Amino acid sequence: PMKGRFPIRRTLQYLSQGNVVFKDSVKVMTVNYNTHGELGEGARKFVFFNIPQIQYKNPWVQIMMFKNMTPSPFLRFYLDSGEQVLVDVETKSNKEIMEHIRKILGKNEETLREEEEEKKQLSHPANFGPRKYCLRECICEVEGQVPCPSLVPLPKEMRGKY
């Protein structure tokens, strides 16, 4: 047994199960919900489960978690200029509110794909570096010069042996 009725939050796979990513200009993601009422079960389960995913996707955003505020909370967001986006949370499912927040603060999948393509283009393994951010230090290790003369011996072709 595990220490948690919902141990999905501690299973590794949940970390990689992320997907949504906020914009590069977000600042604070103030969100309030209710826990005692049984009306907004969807939004409750959403805020309870699908949150560490977005947090691990980018832990550069502020979080606000309240207990009991009002039967009709909200989801106050913030943009570059620190605007105030208003929207209700009551009477909302989980995937619905997830898609809503992804469309509002989250970035479109096209932008993420473009960023991934740009990062791949930035990758240039053809370069040579003595073991750190690249592979094959010098041309000696790879099919070229003598494979590390400091270890493998050499015949009379070299100097100082005649």
Binding site: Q121, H124, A126, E143, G144
Partner: protein
């Protein structure tokens, strides 16, 4: 209308090649890690089979065959200063990123003051030494030597043969075309069109046999087996191309 890289013609030629879901995606000897025993329904199984068939068809999109070539010794920028003094082939190229190896500029020099652009074989060897890929060995493969080729053709096993032939040379090399022609000629003798149904095959088999009129064995095998629609399609293709 030859059109070697056509659409409908190549699609029909691939259709003539037996799909065989069990042969194309045969359980290879790879890192057989314990997979997941998911429970799929009828619709999901049908969709997965369709995806596998599409992947196998995409696997039959290569290679091209356009005869052999000749290693040309280019002579561009001549400098009457060296004339046989500085050798070792100096290469000063800028490796960008998204550029095919055929469009690179491997400025290979010569002992004289000329300016070569890397011979075909030398260019291929340098490309292989640079960025390898699925297999692809530097020098010629020992698997396709004289005695090795004879042993491979005598034991009847043209799956790994074509697999390595595609994953070793380039789609326009001398030894490549030679080995492919030898394998096709060996396949022609005695009907056995079946082993070539799990790898690159349409390189220069049906195309070459239709250009040189060698569809006798294939027609005999088709008549002995079955498939009347395929026979009519082949007759129509022969009437059109010829």
């Amino acid at each position: 209308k030859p059109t070697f890289m056509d659409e409908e013609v190549q699609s029909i030629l691939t259709k003539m090649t037996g799909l065989n879901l069990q042969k194309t995606f045969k359980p290879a000897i790879q890192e057989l890690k314990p997979p997941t025993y998911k429970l799929m329904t009828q619709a999901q199984l049908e969709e997965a089979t369709r995806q596998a068939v599409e992947a196998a068809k995409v696997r039959l999109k290569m290679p091209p065959v356009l005869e052999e070539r000749v290693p040309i010794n280019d002579v561009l920028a001549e400098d009457k200063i060296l004339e046989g003094t500085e050798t070792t082939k100096y290469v000063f190229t800028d490796i960008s990123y998204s550029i095919p190896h055929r469009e690179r500029f491997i400025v290979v020099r010569e002992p004289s003051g000329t300016l070569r652009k890397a011979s075909w074989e030398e260019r291929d060897r340098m490309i292989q030494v640079y960025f390898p890929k699925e297999g692809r060995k530097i020098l010629t493969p020992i698997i396709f030597k004289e005695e090795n080729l004879r042993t491979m053709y005598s034991q009847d096993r043209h799956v790994d043969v074509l697999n390595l032939c595609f994953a070793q040379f380039e789609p326009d090399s001398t030894e490549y075309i030679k080995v492919h022609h030898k394998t096709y000629e060996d396949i022609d003798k005695r009907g056995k069109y079946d082993l070539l149904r799990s790898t690159r095959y349409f390189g220069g088999m049906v195309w070459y046999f239709v250009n040189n009129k060698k569809i006798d064995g294939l027609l005999i095998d088709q008549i002995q087996r079955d498939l009347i629609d395929d026979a009519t399609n082949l007759v129509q293709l022969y009437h059109v191309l010829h």
